[PDB]
């Protein structure tokens, strides 16, 4: 469960917000070393339950290889291409559809994966999802929200609280369960077939919150074909228990992954 820090080899900076670096594990292994920053997260907490998504295996899944435990380290499988939200971003891809498609199929395997082991996410959405050297999507810092120790990102009356990826029973009532993870798939695939526009992208998070509890959507993307629309919308009922599993999800865009070709 602990990894010695002095088997790591760092070789360079991939980001800091605390700072993430690429490195080598025993000298070959290439590795991502999140340093996190001091007083930023409940680190015991973290500790604990970090023993238990180790166990969490899947390939559509960021793996965690261990903790280092000031600061203390949390290394993971390394992903060249970075997070998901700025690869979509990046128009020189010029995306096929069908990748699109495969994208959401990518983390929508590895969501059901999460509730067949009764384990949510609690902040799905492309910022959180990485991209390999394959191009493969795998969802990264699942669960990791409950350790975040910032108010602003604690609430959902936050500053940093994700609201465009909330349903109205978390908005009004921080009710939270499978089915927000639900919600936030739909508006994940909204981010994919927009090409990693924000969602709401007009609005406040405020407006945003009033035009939700309204009953009002996103719309459609221009890339998402009619039954692509469909999926997504299907995880926005207002009536949590009317929306789908991931199980459901995963065959609804296998379906259509079979009909464009
Ligand atoms: O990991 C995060 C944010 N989450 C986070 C959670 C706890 C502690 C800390 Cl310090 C950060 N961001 C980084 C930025 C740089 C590009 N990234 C990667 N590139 C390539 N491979 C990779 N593996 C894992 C992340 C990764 C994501």
Redesign the pocket.
Known sequence: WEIDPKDLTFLKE??T????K?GKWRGQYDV?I????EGS?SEDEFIEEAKVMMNLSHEKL?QLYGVCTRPIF?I????????LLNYLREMRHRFQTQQLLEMCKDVCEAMEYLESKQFLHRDLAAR?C?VNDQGVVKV??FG?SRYVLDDEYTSSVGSKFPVRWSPPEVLMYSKFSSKSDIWAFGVLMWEIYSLGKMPYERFTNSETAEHIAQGLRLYRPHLASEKVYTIMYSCWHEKADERPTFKILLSNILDVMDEES
């Open positions: 991939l980001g917000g605390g700072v993430v690429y991502a999140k340093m996190i920053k997260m960021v949390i993971t499988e390394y992903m060249a291409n970075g997070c959180n990485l990264s810092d990791l």
